[PDB]
Nucleic acid binder design. Sequence first.
RNA 1: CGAAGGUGUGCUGUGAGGCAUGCUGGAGGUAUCAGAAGUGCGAAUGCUGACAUAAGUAACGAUAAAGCGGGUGAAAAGCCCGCUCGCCGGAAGACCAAGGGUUCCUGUCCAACGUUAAUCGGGGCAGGGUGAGUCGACCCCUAAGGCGAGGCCGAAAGGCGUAGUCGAUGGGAAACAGGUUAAUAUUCCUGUACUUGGUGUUACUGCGAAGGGGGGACGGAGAAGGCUAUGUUGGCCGGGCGACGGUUGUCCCGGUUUAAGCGUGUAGGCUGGUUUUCCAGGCAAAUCCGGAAAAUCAAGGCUGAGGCGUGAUGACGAGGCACUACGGUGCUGAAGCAACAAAUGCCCUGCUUCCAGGAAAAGCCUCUAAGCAUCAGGUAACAUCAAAUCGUACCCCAAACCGA
RNA 2: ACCGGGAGAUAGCU
RNA 3: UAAGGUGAUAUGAACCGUUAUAACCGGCGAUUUCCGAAUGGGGAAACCCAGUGUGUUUCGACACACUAUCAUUAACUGAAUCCAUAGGUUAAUGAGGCGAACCGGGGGAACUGAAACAUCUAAGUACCCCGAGGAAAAGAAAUCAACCGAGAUUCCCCCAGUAGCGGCGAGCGAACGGGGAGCAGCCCAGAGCCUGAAUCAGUGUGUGUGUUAGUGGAAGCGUCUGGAAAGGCGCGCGAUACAGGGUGACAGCCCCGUACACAAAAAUGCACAUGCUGUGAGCUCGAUGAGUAGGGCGGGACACGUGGUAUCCUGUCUGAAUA
Lengths: 39, 93, 17, 63
Amino acid sequence: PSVLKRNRSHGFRARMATKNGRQVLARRRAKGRARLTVS
Amino acid sequence: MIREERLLKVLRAPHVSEKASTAMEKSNTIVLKVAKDATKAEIKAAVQKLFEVEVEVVNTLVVKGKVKRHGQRIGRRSDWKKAYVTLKEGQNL
Amino acid sequence: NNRPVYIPRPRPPHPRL
Amino acid sequence: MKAKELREKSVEELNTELLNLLREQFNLRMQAASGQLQQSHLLKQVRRDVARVKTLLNEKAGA
RNA sequence: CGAAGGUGUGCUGUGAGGCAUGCUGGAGGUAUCAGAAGUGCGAAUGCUGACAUAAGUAACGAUAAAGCGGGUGAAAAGCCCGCUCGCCGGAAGACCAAGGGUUCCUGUCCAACGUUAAUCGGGGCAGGGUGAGUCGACCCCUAAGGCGAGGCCGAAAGGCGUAGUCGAUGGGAAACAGGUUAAUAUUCCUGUACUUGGUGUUACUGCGAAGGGGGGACGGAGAAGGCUAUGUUGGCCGGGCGACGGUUGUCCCGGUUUAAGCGUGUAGGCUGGUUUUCCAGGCAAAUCCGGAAAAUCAAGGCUGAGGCGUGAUGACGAGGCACUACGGUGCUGAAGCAACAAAUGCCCUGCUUCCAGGAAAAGCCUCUAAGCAUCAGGUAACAUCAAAUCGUACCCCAAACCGA
RNA sequence: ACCGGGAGAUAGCU
RNA sequence: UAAGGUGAUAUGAACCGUUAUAACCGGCGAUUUCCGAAUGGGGAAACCCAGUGUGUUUCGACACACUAUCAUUAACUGAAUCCAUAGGUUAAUGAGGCGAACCGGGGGAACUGAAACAUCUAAGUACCCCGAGGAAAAGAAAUCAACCGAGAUUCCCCCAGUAGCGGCGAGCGAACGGGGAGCAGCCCAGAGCCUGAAUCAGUGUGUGUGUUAGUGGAAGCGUCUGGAAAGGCGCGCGAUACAGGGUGACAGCCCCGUACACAAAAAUGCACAUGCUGUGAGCUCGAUGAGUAGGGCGGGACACGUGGUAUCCUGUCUGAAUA
């Protein structure tokens, strides 16, 4: 794989673009994991 | 025009190394650790204003932090920018 | 200058130093 | 020395900040590399002085 | 003056158990009477930690192969130097892409690892290491694709889409010879160079944008010649007369290299040239391009490797001269020319054939409405500059990426 | 298909 | 408050002050890099590219303030179609995210039992989306059973797992009435007499009570075991403080300290009387929120089949007066 495609498919901005990305990020923040999506 | 305050807040400190010591006379070049951005124009103007020296070109590079793992969890060192400044003829500290 | 780093007490199987 | 800079006018405060940053900041930073700077409290003192100076000029002028 | 717990003894009752005490333990336990149990473990291929036999058992990983003298070290078939033998050598070598993230160099150490070993290492600790207008990313445009302001169909949904938007692995401009440190060289140093943009001077002086033209901007298959890297040979320069039969010769060893740019524009390929008229052609514009017609000349015009002189009274250098932590540093440093063969490299996006016709946009030259055509803008030369920011270590068909 | 839930699910049986 | 201090891992030099500029705590303030609703554009989150208005002793680019979207208000311009409007510009109003549940809504399953099964518990539950406020929602009568009855709503106790329904099979769940926290009713729809006289909101004043840092605060020694006493023994005292915690073994009299009495330069919640600014005393007699009430056609839904349909919104047609 490549870092470009990895970010475009599961990056912070890429996930945040979709509606469910906000819910996923909120769940992650509630969980408390240090890294949200990647890097 | 570059604010003198900005010029004073971009030069961190000279870097001490054997390569730097050789370059002090091999090519009249010095090495200075500077701010993260440390644009060539701003740092060159700062050097001219402070040391009253003549510089035609300044080279820049960024040194990546080194991962350290001794006893405790891994640790990283802050990335720092190094500038090679070549003075035409003036010699100064 | 900061020569002293305050090396911590290491593990029983630690580098002999 | 709060009262010292409190009474100073905007121009005098600017001149004090200029001279402090030019002289003391580097005279402590350049010596901080190695072989100099026997006394370490000078860095903290100068940092506090510059912080106090920057605290002024925001309420003395423009407020 | 010794609690709980641990660990042995003795006395006790039909028993689950109760009491005393030796030692360790070094700070809590709790008489009798009533209540709550997460209440009493021996198996549910029950769950977590530790410890076992199987066991010193095959294997130590392609069947390319190591050995000796010296040095560090106490310890050296595995480390360092020298010598001998062997393997790969259209690779097991070297340079980049993705990927890894400092594993790269030095000093230092043996906590843990290397299937046993290290003093060694892609291991620990400390330091150093990546220098860009010319390398790329970056940035302009763009194909498929996504978003998709407005807007159409459509009960809601859903379908579709003008413009814009990003979207490269595609197109747009520029540097090489020698050296440099243990780690960095198209970056640093000597040189010669080139590109984009701004200001001034000198000299001349018709531009814009949209509107157009060539070009950018292209497919498959097939064969011929020259040139270059490269190699062989000849001469030339420096060093030599062979541990043993010959070996001053038609002898042996090493060198005989030089980039980009500049002017020549050749070999080869393409196009036949000059003058006049119209275009209902390029949305009306064109001074440019092409199309339609007349007069004249023959070899004009475009592209085009390589070679030629400058680049280069240079560097590079065979091999020597001094100082040496024996690792190395400085100076000088002779010759550097011809013939042959030749490639997948260039001439060559060249030449012949074909259907499946093999993207688009931007930069770039062209003359084009109003106007200015003293001016402004445009062209030739000189001075001055700016070209920012990001990776420049190392591995990269492998011990460092993906398979633990 | 994986994830979290319905669901400590459901009938028989070990 | 202050004689110790530069927060710790984790030592060292360095100094800062000792009676008020050491240091710590609290109130009020300023600064607050980048991503993140991220808001100038792009973008692979912590990166790039920009456009305007301000000031540049080198005028090569720097530094400071703005540049996304909904409807409305004010003002200025401005089509169809002369003002009017469609459209455009400046400023303001709230918000796009997060936060664990609580309410009102829009959709919404599956496994399981009932002889399989129409149907039902399952289950309007898990789950998806919108607004909401410290509570929300709902609620002062064309409310309810009907012959006796109370006059707001919310929640709790039974009433009551009772009446009834259901292939009377699994299960489902009533009403009235009583006892409790709590009670406030109303507003205007509209003319006159009489006025800023009650009440409400804002703005300041001074008081009390609290908060955001705190002060004071009672009383002990000997011997033995003893590593050290806070443990046995002699005894005295405090107690409005023998809650608790730390100190070489179990501490009322060693300390923090609990009972109790005090403390605010500044801000902050509530209760007061008032200067001032706005809604607005009190009385009278009217008067009844209209294309409405009702009816009809056609949808989904009370076990069930628009049906004999009382009732829930209507897609659509008709259609009275206000005691």
